[PDB]
Amino acid sequence: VDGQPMYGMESQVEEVRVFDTGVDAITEVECFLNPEMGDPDENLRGFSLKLSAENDFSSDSPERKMLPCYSTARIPLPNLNLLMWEAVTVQTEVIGITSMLNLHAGSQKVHEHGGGKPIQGSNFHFFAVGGEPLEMQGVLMNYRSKYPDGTITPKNPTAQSQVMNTDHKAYLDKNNAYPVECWVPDPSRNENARYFGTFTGGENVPPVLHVTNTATTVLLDEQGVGPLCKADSLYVSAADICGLFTNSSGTQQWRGLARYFKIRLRKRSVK
> Minimum distance between the CB of residue 243 and its own copies, rounded to whole angstroms?
7
42 is a contact residue toward Ca ion (CB under 5 A): no
Q: Tell the smallest beta-carbon distance from residue 85 to its own copies (Å).
A: 19
15 binds Ca ion (CB under 5 A): yes
Binding-site partner at residue 14 among its own copies, Ca ion, none, CB < 5 to 8 Å by type: its own copies
Interatomic CA distance for residues 218 and 118, integer angstroms: 34
Q: Which helix (H) or strand (E) holds 142?
A: none
Q: How far apart are the first and last CA of the chain?
A: 25
Q: Which of 24, 77, 89, 79 lies closest to 268 in space, CA to CA?
A: 24
Residues with Cβ < 8 Å from 261, sequence gap 6 or more? 29, 30, 31, 32, 33, 90, 91, 92, 127, 129, 236
> CB within 8 A of 215, min separation 6: which ones?
91, 93
The verdict on 149 binding its own copies (CB under 8 A) reads no
E strand intervals along 118-159: 123-130, 135-138
Q: Residue 135 or 181: which CB sits closer to Ca ion?
A: 135
Does residue 164 touch its own copies according to CB under 8 A?
A: yes
The one of its own copies, Ca ion, none whose footprint includes residue 198, by CB under 5 to 8 A per kind, is its own copies
Span near Ca ion by CB under 5 A; candidates 10-18, 55-63, 199-207, 219-227: 10-18
Q: Does 246 bind its own copies (CB under 8 A)?
A: yes
Candidate ranges 78-86, 109-117, 230-238; the one touching its own copies (CB under 8 A): 109-117
- Residue 131 beta carbon to its own copies: minimum distance, rounded to whole angstroms: 13
| Beta carbon nearer to Ca ion, 15 or 222 | 15
In eight-state DSSP terms, residue 82 is: -
Site size toward its own copies (CB under 8 A) is 121
Q: Whose Cβ is closer to its own copies: residue 198's or residue 269's?
A: 198
Q: How far is the CB of 234 from Ca ion (least distance, A)?
A: 17
Give the residue among 156, 158, 153 at the shortest CA–CA distance from 138: 153
Binding status of residue 235 toward its own copies by CB under 8 A:
no
Cα 249 to Cα 181: distance, rounded to the nearest angstrom: 25
Residues 129 and 87: beta-carbon distance below 8 Å: yes
The entry of Ca ion, its own copies, none near residue 175 (CB within 5 to 8 angstroms by kind) is none
Could you say which of 38, 46, 131, 133 contacts its own copies (CB under 8 A)? 46
Q: How far is CA 184 from the centre of its chain?
A: 11
Supply the minimum distance, in Å, between the C-beta of residue 136 and Ca ion.
Answer: 14
What is the contact surface with Ca ion in residues (CB under 5 A)?
Answer: 15
